[PDB]
């Protein structure tokens, strides 16, 4: 296992689980995506263009909300575009990512 390895009882390597539900052409979704992209983190986008079933799945997790986008970090609902930009403005988003 040649290389420079960090040890601190990590066990199986796992990282932050970051999810965002979008319509590809929604300007608020686009703005949220840009922020996540600028952070350089790895994330999963659920592009649900025209998919009503997926929207209902989203609503079930997002406090019944059907507005877009909806963002989750480590299974916690963070909210929408304004919520994530607000967090960043307060210096609270990097810790969630989690740095």
From Swiss-Prot:
> One GO molecular-function annotation for this sequence?
glutathione disulfide oxidoreductase activity
Pfam families the UniProt entry points to: Glutaredoxin
Per UniProt, the keywords (alphabetical) are: Disulfide bond, Electron transport, Redox-active center, Transport
**Gene3D superfamilies recorded for this chain?**
Glutaredoxin (3.40.30.10)
- Taxonomically, the superkingdom here is Bacteria
* BP-aspect Gene Ontology terms: cell redox homeostasis; cellular response to oxidative stress
> According to the UniProt record, which cysteines are disulfide-bonded?
26-29
CDD domains the UniProt entry points to? GRX_GRXb_1_3_like
Would you name any one GO CC term? cytoplasm
InterPro entries, from UniProt?
Answer: GLR_AS, Glutaredoxin, Glutaredoxin_subgr, Glutathione_S-Trfase_N, GRX_bact, Thioredoxin-like_sf
The record's similarity note reads:
Belongs to the glutaredoxin family.
Function noted in UniProt: Has a glutathione-disulfide oxidoreductase activity in the presence of NADPH and glutathione reductase. Reduces low molecular weight disulfides and proteins.
Recorded protein name is Probable glutaredoxin ssr2061
**Highest lineage ranks of the organism?**
Bacteria, Bacillati, Cyanobacteriota, Cyanophyceae, Synechococcales
């Amino acid at each position: 296992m040649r290389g420079s390895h960090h040890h601190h009882h990590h066990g199986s390597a796992v990282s932050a689980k970051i999810e965002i539900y979008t319509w590809s052409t929604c300007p608020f979704c686009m703005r949220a995506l840009a922020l996540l992209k600028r952070k350089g983190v790895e994330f999963q986008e659920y592009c649900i263009d025209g998919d009503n079933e997926a929207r209902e799945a989203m609503a079930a997790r997002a406090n019944g909300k059907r507005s877009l986008p909806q963002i989750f970090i480590d299974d916690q609902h963070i909210g929408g575009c304004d919520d994530i930009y607000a967090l960043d403005g307060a210096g609270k988003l990097d810790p969630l990512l989690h740095s």
